């Protein structure tokens, strides 16, 4: 949460990402106090910071499996805004984050997030990049 250069915030969100992919489920009792950081991102003016914040949300969702769905509730709305208005690698990182969050979720909300995202998947089957 320092604002002099985006490299420090990029570094800290990268720390969150490699913590989440390094240690599996012991990050879960400290999940909420770690995820309350991450919503200060995703609205920044840098594409790299938003992309690595989506990767950190995706890494925390992969680490949780399937716990803490009421703790990511402040994250789904900027992800929905980003898959509506933004396209590119940010769309891919947002789609990774949402696709990792939706197995954690109850049936009605995950079904609503599943049925209104497959159009984006059919649209992005024409993508040339391998990642």
């Amino acid at each position: 949460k320092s604002k002099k250069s985006w490299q420090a915030r990029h570094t800290g969100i990268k720390i969150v990402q490699q913590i989440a992919i390094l240690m599996g489920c012991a990050i879960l009792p400290h999940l909420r106090s770690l995820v309350e950081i991450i919503e200060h991102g995703l609205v920044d003016e840098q594409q790299k910071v938003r992309t690595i914040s989506a990767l950190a949300i995706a890494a925390l969702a992969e680490a949780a499996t399937p716990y803490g769905i009421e703790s990511f509730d402040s994250v789904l709305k900027p992800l929905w805004k980003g898959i509506r208005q933004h396209r590119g690698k940010g769309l891919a990182a947002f789609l990774k984050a949402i696709g990792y969050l939706i197995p954690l979720m109850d049936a009605e909300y995950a079904n609503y997030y599943t049925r209104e995202v497959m159009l984006i998947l059919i649209r992005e089957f024409q993508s040339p990049d391998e990642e």
Partner: protein, 625 residues
């Protein structure tokens, strides 16, 4: 009408109730109420009421009659409209909407203030007029002093005379000049462009005479005014000047008066009007009519149990009325945007009375306030289905407006004091308990106006939504209304501010007036004005207290409504930004292609249970979807 004046006087003198029929423009509204001569209402300490289904007809006619009488408007001649009164102790003759007279009935069942009541434009058969006819029939028994006149454009007398216990009829012979009719070769899918082209052609080619174009609504009319005005200027050098004027229900009085203004010479006037122009009033000098064949009509669906206003094709009778407007001065022309076949075969002969078309909740509360116990038995000219009435009583009961007995509660009696739908009145009345009354007051006023609040041009959408976003409150469309109203309160260069903001000044101004009138009601009634700091919960609760019947729950996919278990989607106007809003309260049900729910605000389910436990009991709920 003047050639008949003696004949009319004789009928009036002889009978308590009379029916008077004549084509529009014959002079029914303006001249007849001049019954003041025979009546001498003022000496008796009474007035005469003339009721109009349309606000514009009441306001404009009153202004005209005041001039005809050589008195000041608001004085001897005045008008009464819902949030707009222009009357005084001096008022002799009061033109008013039927809704208003019904409200006066609620306070005084006898309507002792009036010696004569004239229900005009009966042919429209609005709900308010239908109730008024029922009530008057009985009041007449009570007061031999009261005289009633029913006026209608339709030459058809019989149904009314019989309803009136074989009241006598006076008919005025039709003066209308012949009007030639033009039809289109083929059906036209997009009528507005076609309407614009026809207007321009008439102005260039045709000899002097004004044009009357019939459109559907304000937004469409406003669009046509700009396009026609621009094109007219383009005609410019070659063609004479063409003035263009809008007319619709909302227009302020000063603007309504503009339609009367004379055309420049060789220049022409075009009035772009809703159906107000059909029978309600006449603009002298119209020779040419353009009839697209559409109107905004209320529709009711009994299975779904919902009203909705849709644009639909006009009845044959209304098509004839529109053409007739061309004939008043001299031989005219009417351009019908459809084929002769459609006119003969397709158009339904006549529209149904509004009573058949409506949700009855407002009417039931009104009748109860009237002191009518037997709702089923009420002598309607055309009785509504019993089921619609039963549903209305049940809804009022859950609202707590009526008890299980069907008697008014303190809340029902107070709600009757407010000129709004019961859900809105209840929401407003409860708000002080919520400590939100000031915010609710603004929301209710904002709800009472068109969604002309936000303007989105089709091409212009991006900028317009960017402007809206400033006000927008996530998961709370009702809150957005509060934000925009509050901002509208403080904005330098108000007219320009609205335009830059993509907001309709007309709607916001109307909302401002309504809020002022409602606040006065709250002051009189002793409903304290309350507010808190940053309490969204209290606002959502207050909305729930009124709206708990109109709630939808987030389905596994889509939304389902608590009442009638209907599948619906949140209207595209709002984004369910928050995933959290599982439960939403919605203002309206729109039925374009699919079923949509408009103007939604999130609500906690526990609040619904807490707020309306009778409604929220599981026993009434069907097997769990």
């Amino acid at each position: 009408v003047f050639p008949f004046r003696e004949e009319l006087l004789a009928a009036i003198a002889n009978h308590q109730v009379l029916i008077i029929e004549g084509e529009t423009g014959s002079g029914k509204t303006t001249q007849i109420p001049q019954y003041l001569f025979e009546e001498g209402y003022t000496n008796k300490g009474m007035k005469i009421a003339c009721t109009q289904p349309r606000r514009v007809a009441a306001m404009s006619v009153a202004a005209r009659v005041a001039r005809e009488m050589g008195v000041k408007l608001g004085n001897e001649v005045g008008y009464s409209i819902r949030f707009e009164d222009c009357t005084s102790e001096r008022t002799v003759l009061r033109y008013m909407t039927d809704g208003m007279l019904l409200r006066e009935f609620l306070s005084e069942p006898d309507l002792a203030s009036y010696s004569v009541v004239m229900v005009d434009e009966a042919h429209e058969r609005t709900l308010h007029t239908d109730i008024l006819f029922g009530l008057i029939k009985d009041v007449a028994r009570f007061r031999p002093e009261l005289k009633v006149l029913v006026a209608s454009a339709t030459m058809d007398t019989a149904r009314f005379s019989t309803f009136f216990d074989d009241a006598p009829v006076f008919r005025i012979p039709g003066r209308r000049f012949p009007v030639d009719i033009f039809y289109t070769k083929a059906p036209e899918a997009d009528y507005l462009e076609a309407c614009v082209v026809s207007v321009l052609q008439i102005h260039v080619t045709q000899p002097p005479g004004d044009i009357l174009v019939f459109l559907t609504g304000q937004e469409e009319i406003e669009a046509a005014c700009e396009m026609l005005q621009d094109r007219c200027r383009r005609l410019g050098s070659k063609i004479r000047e063409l003035l263009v004027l809008p007319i619709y229900a909302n227009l302020p009085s000063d603007m309504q008066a503009r339609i009367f203004q004379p055309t420049p010479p060789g220049a022409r006037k075009v009035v772009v009007a809703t159906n107000i122009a059909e029978t309600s009033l006449t603009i002298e000098g119209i020779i040419y009519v353009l009839d697209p064949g559409f109107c905004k009509q209320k529709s009711y669906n009994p299975r779904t149990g919902m009203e909705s206003l849709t644009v639909t094709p006009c009845s044959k009778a209304s098509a004839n009325q529109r053409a007739g407007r061309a004939g008043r001065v001299a031989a005219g022309k009417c351009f019908r945007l459809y084929t002769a076949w459609a006119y003969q075969h397709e158009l339904e002969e006549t529209t149904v009375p509004e009573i058949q078309r409506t949700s009855l909740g407002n009417v039931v509360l009104l009748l109860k306030s009237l002191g009518i116990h037997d709702l089923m038995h009420f002598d309607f000219l055309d009785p509504p289905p019993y089921e619609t009435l039963l549903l209305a009583l049940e809804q009022l009961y859950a609202l707590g407006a009526l008890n299980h007995l069907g008697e008014l509660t303190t809340s029902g009696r107070k709600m009757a004091e407010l000129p709004v739908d019961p859900m809105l009145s209840k929401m407003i009345l409860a708000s002080e308990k919520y400590s939100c009354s000031e915010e609710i007051l603004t929301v209710a006023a904002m709800l009472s106006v068109n969604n002309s609040i936000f303007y989105r041009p089709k091409d212009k959408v991006v900028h317009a939504d960017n402007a809206r976003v400033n006000f927008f409150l996530p998961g709370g469309d009702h809150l957005v209304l509060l934000n925009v109203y509050t901002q509208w309160a403080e904005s330098g260069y108000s007219s320009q501010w609205c335009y830059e903001n993509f907001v309709q000044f007309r709607s916001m101004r109307r909302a401002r007036d309504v809020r002022e009138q409602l606040e006065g009601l709250l002051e009189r009634v002793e409903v304290g004005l309350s507010s808190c700091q940053g309490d969204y919960i209290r606002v959502r609760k207050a909305i729930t207290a009124g709206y708990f019947y109109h709630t939808a729950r987030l389905t596994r996919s889509g939304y389902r409504t608590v009442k009638q278990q209907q599948t619906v989607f949140i209207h595209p106007n709002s984004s369910l930004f928050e995933q959290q809003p599982r439960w939403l309260l919605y203002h309206e049900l729109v039925l374009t292609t699919k079923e949509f729910m408009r103007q939604v605000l999130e609500i906690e389910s526990s609040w619904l249970l807490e707020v309306a436990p009778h409604y929220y009991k599981a026993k009434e709920l069907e097997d769990p979807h």
